Amino acid sequence: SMIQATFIRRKGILESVELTGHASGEYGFDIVCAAVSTLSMNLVNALEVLADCTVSLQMDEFDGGYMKIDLSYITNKSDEKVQLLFEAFLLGITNLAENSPEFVTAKIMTQ
Amino acid sequence: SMIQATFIRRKGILESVELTGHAGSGEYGFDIVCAAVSTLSMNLVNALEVLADCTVSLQMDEFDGGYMKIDLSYITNKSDEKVQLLFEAFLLGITNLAENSPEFVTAKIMTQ
Ligand SMILES: [Ca+2]
Ligand SMILES: [Ca+2]
């Protein structure tokens, strides 16, 4: 199947990412899925543990799976450590999109 | 097949990490874990360069299970806030894999 990641950047800072497809494909897709799940879970964990950042997170396993990490209402969303971890996450997803376009599509939107 | 990661912390800062086994073994469960480890590994290298203004020394090979060592010991800005945050995030991810999949990943943290 396909993983689609949609990032929203507002006033220069990353605020949210929405992913669909994280939950059935060939071997190659299983491997890409593992890479995306790992990066996603490490962002949430590193935000909480290392950047003193409470994340809003919606996740479900239905019809391909859905995940949204949303900092839009989080007080220290524009924090340097927060934004660094988010940028690193964006970098990893972008590299997967570049290396594995058959399995990953990324949209970055400024608002 | 087993991934072994060895982190060295010196005077409070992460200085190096050495990994072996992550090249895969040909077993489904382990290769999913290997994919997780390689993704985090390569993201640390790429994020350090792109986002933390830090070019690492990096040795890598694919022989007998794979070897990788990221070494900041000689880099003058090893102690930088962005550099250490990325490195601690990587340690956090590896440690979480060691917790969740002990049968595939073992970690050593050494404060020498
Ligand atoms: Ca491209
Ligand atoms: Ca334990």
Resolution of this model in Å is 1.9
Q: How far is CA A7 from CA A26, A43, A72, in A?
A: 26, 14, 12
Element (H, E) at A99: helix A80-99
Judge: A38–B92 Cβ closer than 8 Å, yes or no. Answer: no
CA dist B84 → A101, B45, B91 (Å)? 31, 12, 10
Cα(A30)–Cα(A26) distance, integer angstroms? 6
Order of all β-strands in the sheet with A56-60: A56-60, A66-70, A13-20, A3-10, A104-110
Residue-number span of the structural domain to which A96 is assigned: 1-111
The ligand that comes nearest to the alpha carbon of residue A96 is: 1
Q: Where does chain B have alpha helices with state H?
A: 28-51, 81-100
Exp. method: X-ray
Cα A19 vs. chain centroid, distance in angstroms? 6
Ligand number nearest CA of B96 is: 2
Q: Answer whether A45 sits within 8 Å of B93, measured CB to CB.
A: yes
Sign of CA dihedral B89, B81, A74, A69: negative
Q: Kindly identify which residue of chain A lies nearest to residue B83, measuring between CA atoms.
A: A84
CB contact under 8 A, B86 and A81: no
Q: Could you tell me what percentage of chain B is helix, strand and coil, using 3-state DSSP and rounding each to the nearest 5?
A: 40, 30, 30
Query: Do the chains contact at A84 and B88, CB–CB below 8 Å?
Result: no
Q: How close, in Å, is residue A31 to chain B by CA atoms?
A: 6
Calpha distance B62→B68 (Å, rounded): 9
Asked whether B45 and B56 are in contact (CB, 8 A), the reply is yes
**B95 contact A CB<8A:** no
Chain A residues with CB-CB distance to B22 below 8 A: none
What is the domain count for chain A?
A: 1
CATH code of residue B13: 3.30.70.1490
